[PDB]
Amino acid sequence: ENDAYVHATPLIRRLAREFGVNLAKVKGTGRKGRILREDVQAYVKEAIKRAEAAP
Amino acid sequence: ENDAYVHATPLIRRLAREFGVNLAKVKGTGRKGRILREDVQAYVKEAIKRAEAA
Ligand SMILES: [Zn+2]
């Protein structure tokens, strides 16, 4: 529940809580950097890739 | 779209596609191992942790 969380929309807050996302690590592509659903989806996809490639 | 996907419920299939989840890697806790939403959530949370420690 950091600054990124304060600035996120209720729906994005909820998604980040559900899946353990630190929104400070997500690159927002909305207006003025606002985090969009597809931004969290891209972050999660890439995390899963790196995790499955890791030993 | 593997066998794990074939056996998953429509909402779990949609979730796996949206977040790039290989459902064969998710341990289901529903009846007979059916994958539940909270299982996908747990898998994603731990994946993020594993990706950071790498
Ligand atoms: Zn602020």
Swiss-Prot record, chain A:
Sequence similarity: Belongs to the 2-oxoacid dehydrogenase family.
Subunit note: Forms a 24-polypeptide structural core with octahedral symmetry.
Highest taxon in the source lineage: Bacteria
Domain Peripheral subunit-binding (PSBD): from-to ranges: 7-44
Task performed by this protein: The pyruvate dehydrogenase complex catalyzes the overall conversion of pyruvate to acetyl-CoA and CO(2). It contains multiple copies of three enzymatic components: pyruvate dehydrogenase (E1), dihydrolipoamide acetyltransferase (E2) and lipoamide dehydrogenase (E3).
Coiled-coil residue spans: none
Protein name: Dihydrolipoyllysine-residue acetyltransferase component of pyruvate dehydrogenase complex
